[PDB]
Design a binder for this molecule. Structure first.
Ligand SMILES: Oc1cc2ccccc2cc1O
Length: 222
């Protein structure tokens, strides 16, 4: 398949990304608590449902939530301010809460079944969100870094396999602050560092210029 791109909602961030986040790729956004990673996830879950002329892929979404941070009412707001019907947008987001890191890993295998079911339809899965990818692994494997890295490596390999095999954009969030961070090392296809700037602006930079955007009723925008 050709590489599809999903607009983030911000022209600035899209330019930094070469058009948007890519299918057949894992995009990892990392930054401190409150930097806007989950807002970007919510915005992408709407944008992907637009037609390509508007920066989407007419796609369905699957969302694995590890921190109870998915907000359907926020999806509704972004959808209504992106000219989409909010009910239709929510009907095309499959949502699961991961109870722990092992359940999170099983959910990726379960996601493959729905991906296959929708593959030949007019609304194939085009976006798989894992928010937060690392939170359960970090809490469960305190003092056991080597084992944590083994499990994360398999989890990321599973996500890679889905991105490439089914032409999906995988978007994962990772909280990194004071003294923290192996990030995801070199595993993601693309690492985006997100941070707060003056006056509530958000700033993004590729790791391995800078885009600037705001959180608004449209999700994010310039
Ligand atoms: O109904 C489902 C929703 C999911 C969401 C995320 C990952 C896997 C899922 C599997 C489902 O059957």
């Amino acid at each position: 398949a050709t590489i599809g791109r999903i607009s983030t909602g911000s022209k600035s961030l899209d330019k930094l990304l070469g058009g948007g986040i890519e299918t057949q790729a894992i995009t990892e956004v990392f930054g401190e608590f409150g930097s806007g990673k989950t807002q970007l996830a919510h915005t992408l879950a709407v944008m992907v449902q637009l037609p390509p002329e508007e920066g989407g892929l007419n796609g369905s979404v699957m969302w694995i939530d590890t921190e109870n941070t998915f907000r359907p009412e926020r999806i509704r707001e972004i959808a209504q301010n992106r000219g989409l019907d909010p009910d239709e947008v929510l009907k095309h987001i499959a949502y699961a809460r991961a109870f722990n890191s092992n359940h999170q890993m099983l959910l990726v295998q379960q996601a493959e079944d729905m991906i296959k079911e929708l593959l030949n339809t007019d609304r194939p899965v085009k976006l798989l969100i894992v928010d937060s990818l690392t939170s359960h692994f970090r809490s469960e494997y305190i003092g056991a870094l080597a084992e944590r890295q083994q499990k994360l490596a398999k989890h990321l390999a599973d996500l890679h396999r889905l991105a490439n095999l089914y032409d999906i954009a995988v978007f994962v969030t990772n909280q990194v602050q004071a003294n923290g961070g192996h990030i995801l090392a070199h595993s993601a296809t693309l690492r985006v560092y997100l941070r707060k700037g003056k006056g509530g602006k958000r700033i993004a930079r590729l790791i391995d210029g800078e885009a600037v955007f705001s959180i608004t009723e449209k999700g994010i925008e310039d």
